């Protein structure tokens, strides 16, 4: 009847119907299992919890993310998450509507192939399609030219597009993302005597990072100000009532996005990666790419990230270039919105891989490019 | 036919049938034997007395508690007490019904094993099960989350439970209990010239403690008030008609629960133990445990104990926490009530260790 | 004149002079105070006891460890222990020689800063330096490449080093150590009817653990053998003359090192932690790290721990890898020996933080990396 749009990013599922302005179902991509003792199957004791229900009882659970660095590693947990999305969150039969899924570029083929297998075997989905997230972000933005930097929980990637034409050879991928920043914050908080070792404490640290961290315009100046003043400190209340205080850490955790060497990686920063991706393109393309820099994803939601982005790109690029960072207030859902647009186009209706095609052709048809 | 629920705590047996709101049989766990001369076996002279019958004739008897600090030490006396419970108090064949017994955590394995041996050898019980008392107290309370402090005559223990899931690594046990308080009161009463040396006099002192003692909100203020006034004194009549007067002792005996150093123990108080047990749990569990503190047992029946409990826990915990002490009027029987609930659940019927299982597997199946 | 080397680990002080093969002063890091009654200040009644003197009279004392999980919590007791080390055990003025102290990685900054404050204020030490223990262990071992697992009373940590170059981003820390094992043994001994509640009884249980415990090669097989035989039981005589008998507990207490869930911790075992730390390193580093596994500390002194270590690491690693566990007979003092080597190098003489530097720069200079 109506197409389903589902952005299953690392640690977050956003699912809804095509034509809507926002998905109904937004929940963490986690599976929690009891910790301290075996499950009493005789009583009404559950052996697993999914999403917000797992978050509510995380104090006695071990939490796992089935998607890691954009690649699904535990397929049973992925099946359970999909089942809960379809029958518990969206109140819809999967066998009633076609599905549009999202994936990061430069992923292993088997990941997509097995995903299709599930979507056609466990669930009797009529038709399905998998799209790249950055293309959907540019679709949501409303332009046909631009270079998209999409950063989530597991994967950061840069994709340029000119006049609606893809540039596959300039796509760049980096494994630094929000989960690495959360781990780095857990490491750094031990300097003030705060210990977080478990997965629930990891969720607490992720909340702290989302609520207090920000990007500094100049790292050295901000470090000097934090060392010579107390105006940078902020307080946070723990679930048990204890209060912690945080200082320069607020701008040291996201600084890893521009200096990956903080966590021991040889790669360059996001600004350098964007500049290098632009310098791949033909000399007649670079100016429009400079004028159109598009951000999407949760990891781009740090305050001040756009200003630092534009400053760094202006430093790298010649002085005669227009440089614009486009950071909409609704970056987090941008990809989903793009899907909701793409599934609503009548010109997209040829993209649907029907069950005749999957059965006759096999898994390889998931790598087709109809266009 | 109908399950039997029996809470055999140190110095008190509470036995009844499952589904009832209270046990029929509540009596002391004592065995009394004649003191001054050998028993005239020729005449109708009994050589031993059990329970209330021993209490009635305690003036010529030496009294013994077969259970000490939650561990059975005299098995013949335990057998006699069980026999009197089954054939004299409850008027029921043990070989007719299954049995649910209670035990304190962190007890020696052999204690349970031998108990099972008795319940399957001397008495031909069809099936039996042993449960932890704090879990039964939480079952009686009606909640699924909370930390239970159970204190009786020999053992005090703290057990937290969250969403029905046990937390075995946070269980705490302390040997200070009502018997130690009775001994401390016997020691302290010598300051006013009152001497109690025998076991019957120990029972008298236990009655005095149960009838006059209470917990002070502030120990220093109460001591100052007692020293500067006579409004704290109370009178008590002895069995022979003599009258004694008691003062600050009324709140000094239970104060040992919060200051064990009064009796030479290095451990911390019950409030500190509860706080430490809570600080073991995961940071996402502690708030619900703060909101649910459950008391059970006779030693928690002192007036004002809940107020001092909440005040101390509020002092230790952060200011943003909800702290509640739940002290029902029927704490003394709470454990038993929990058993009466647990034995009545159809989901519990898989727990019964039948005689096939005990005979085929051996003692280890009790664990 | 001659540098002083002092390894003040949780519950044990090992102090001596640089250039020696072993410290003179080895004694517990405890402070004991009278229990049952107030101290008669009129008579010659002491109010506190330190080290072996506290151990001799522990029957009437309450004992405290000023260092807990590698972090100093009672600074007055630490000051008293340092004073007794300097003026009673080593017969040396602190204001005569420079000092080299040891610390675990990922500790709070304030701990080190206050330590320096004491070493420069209460004692007029000319110069001082704080070093990581695992680096000193590798220095003592004599190699330049290897991954060190150091486990003591409060902290276990893994540090890899390649060609003398540090790898700070692969350092791992765990709070499970010998004190937790002693507490677990105290818990487990109640199954046989043995009760130990006080601190002196804790010392007795620690002696029992040091004297009778061992690591089993296969836990399930050893449990089956102990259940089906009496050859595993051992006897121990208490100070009052009573004799206790111990069975499978001998190998159940150290098994917590490989299965932390025995005490309710979500973390992995020491073998899994070592494997994960190795899998951080670059693919060109891992083989040498496999060939060089170095153990140090008291908690690594259990018989059979090296065999279980090598078996587990062989199980985790590929079959083509050389895997070696290096467990010298003198692991307990290894860190100290490393210090005695490091303080004797002429190239180390630039490391000394002199009083000019501390006074002019302040506490922050304790975090400097001269190198
Ligand atoms: N306001 C915020 N500031 C900083 N980081 C955020 C914020 N909101 C979300 N994040 C981070 O974004 C990451 C993933 O978000 P998102 O990209 O929306 O989902 P997914 O990665 O599953 O596609 C999370 O790890 C989270 O920590
Ligand atoms: N009203 C009371 N006030 C103070 N203590 C009491 C009171 N009633 C009973 N006790 C004490 O409780 C102790 C044991 O009671 P209980 O816990 O019910 O039985 P058991 O310990 O055998 O399980 C006795 O030593 C008794 O002194
Ligand atoms: N032979 C042994 N077997 C098992 N454990 C030991 C042995 N010797 C010492 N230990 C343990 O090592 C722990 C600390 O020793 P060590 O690491 O040398 O000192 P520190 O931890 O203070 O640096 C103690 O808790 C002790 O129980
Ligand atoms: Mg995303
Ligand atoms: Mg009781
Ligand atoms: Mg050590």
Curated annotation (Swiss-Prot), chains A, C:
Q: What keywords were assigned to this record?
A: Acetylation, ADP-ribosylation, ATP-binding, Cytoplasm, Cytoskeleton, Hydrolase, Methylation, Muscle protein, Nucleotide-binding, Oxidation
GO BP field: actin filament bundle assembly; actin filament polymerization; mesenchyme migration; positive regulation of gene expression; skeletal muscle fiber development; skeletal muscle thin filament assembly
Residues found modified as ADP-ribosylarginine: 173
According to the UniProt record, list the residues that bear N6-malonyllysine: 57
Which residue ranges does the record annotate as region Interaction with alpha-actinin?
Answer: 106-119, 354-366
Cross-referenced CDD domains: ASKHA_NBD_actin
* One GO molecular-function entry: hydrolase activity
Q: Which residues carry this modification: Methionine (R)-sulfoxide?
A: 40, 43
InterPro entries from the UniProt entry: Actin, Actin/actin-like_CS, Actin_CS, ATPase_NBD
Residue positions, PTM Tele-methylhistidine: 69
Instruction: Identify the SMART domains for this entry.
Output: ACTIN
Disulfide-linked positions = none
A Pfam family annotated for this chain is Actin
**What's the PTM story here?**
Oxidation of Met-40 and Met-43 by MICALs (MICAL1, MICAL2 or MICAL3) to form methionine sulfoxide promotes actin filament depolymerization. MICAL1 and MICAL2 produce the (R)-S-oxide form. The (R)-S-oxide form is reverted by MSRB1 and MSRB2, which promotes actin repolymerization. Can be mono-ADP-ribosylated on Arg-173 by SpvB of Salmonella spp. This modification blocks subsequent polymerization and leads to cell death.
What does the record give as EC number? 3.6.4.-
Family according to the record: Belongs to the actin family.
Instruction: Summarize the protein's role.
Output: Actins are highly conserved proteins that are involved in various types of cell motility and are ubiquitously expressed in all eukaryotic cells.
Misc. remarks from the entry: In vertebrates 3 main groups of actin isoforms, alpha, beta and gamma have been identified. The alpha actins are found in muscle tissues and are a major constituent of the contractile apparatus. The beta and gamma actins coexist in most cell types as components of the cytoskeleton and as mediators of internal cell motility.
Give the record's subunit note: Polymerization of globular actin (G-actin) leads to a structural filament (F-actin) in the form of a two-stranded helix. Each actin can bind to 4 others. Interacts with alpha-actinin. Identified in a complex composed of ACTA1, COBL, GSN and TMSB4X. Interacts with TTID. Interacts (via its C-terminus) with USP25.
This protein is called Actin, alpha skeletal muscle
Q: Which gene encodes it?
A: ACTA1
């Amino acid at each position: 009847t109506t197409a389903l749009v589902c952005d299953n990013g690392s640690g977050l599922v956003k699912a809804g119907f095509a034509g809507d302005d926002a998905p109904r179902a937004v929940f963490p991509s986690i599976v929690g299992r009891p910790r301290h003792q075996g499950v009493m199957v005789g009583m009404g004791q559950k052996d697993s919890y999914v999403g917000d229900e797992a978050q509510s009882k995380r104090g006695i659970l071990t939490l796992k993310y089935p998607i890691e660095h954009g690649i699904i590693t535990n397929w049973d947990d992925m099946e359970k998450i999909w089942h809960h999305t379809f029958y518990n969150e969206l109140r819809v039969a999967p066998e009633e509507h076609p599905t549009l899924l999202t994936e990061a570029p430069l992923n292993p083929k088997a990941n997509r192939e097995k995903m299709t297998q599930i979507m056609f075997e466990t669930f009797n989905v009529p038709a399905m399609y998998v799209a790249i997230q950055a293309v959907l972000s540019l679709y949501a933005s409303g332009r046909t030219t631009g270079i998209v930097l999409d950063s989530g929980d597991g994967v950061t990637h840069n994709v340029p597009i000119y006049e609606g034409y893809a540039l596959p050879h300039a796509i760049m991928r980096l494994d630094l993302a929000g989960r690495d920043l959360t781990d780095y914050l857990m490491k750094i908080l031990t300097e003030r005597g705060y210990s977080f070792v478990t997965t629930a404490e990891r969720e607490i640290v992720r909340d702290i990072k989302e609520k207090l961290c920000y990007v500094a315009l100049d790292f050295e100046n901000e470090m000097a100000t934090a060392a010579s003043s107390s105006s940078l400190e902020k307080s946070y209340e723990l679930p048990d009532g204890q209060v912690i205080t945080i200082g320069n850490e607020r701008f040291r955790c996201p600084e890893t996005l521009f200096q990956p060497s903080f966590i021991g990686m040889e790669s360059a920063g996001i600004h350098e990666t964007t500049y290098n991706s632009i310098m791949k393109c033909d000399i007649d393309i670079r100016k429009d790419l400079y004028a159109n820099n598009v951000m999407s994803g949760g990891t781009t939601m740090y305050p001040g990230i756009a200003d630092r982005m534009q400053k760094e790109i202006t430093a790298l690029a010649p002085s005669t270039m227009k440089i614009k960072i486009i950071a909409p207030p609704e970056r987090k859902y941008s990809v989903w919105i793009g899907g909701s647009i793409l599934a609503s186009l009548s010109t997209f209706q040829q993209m649907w891989i029907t069950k005749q095609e999957y059965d006759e052709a096999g898994p390889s048809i998931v790598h087709r490019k109809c266009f």
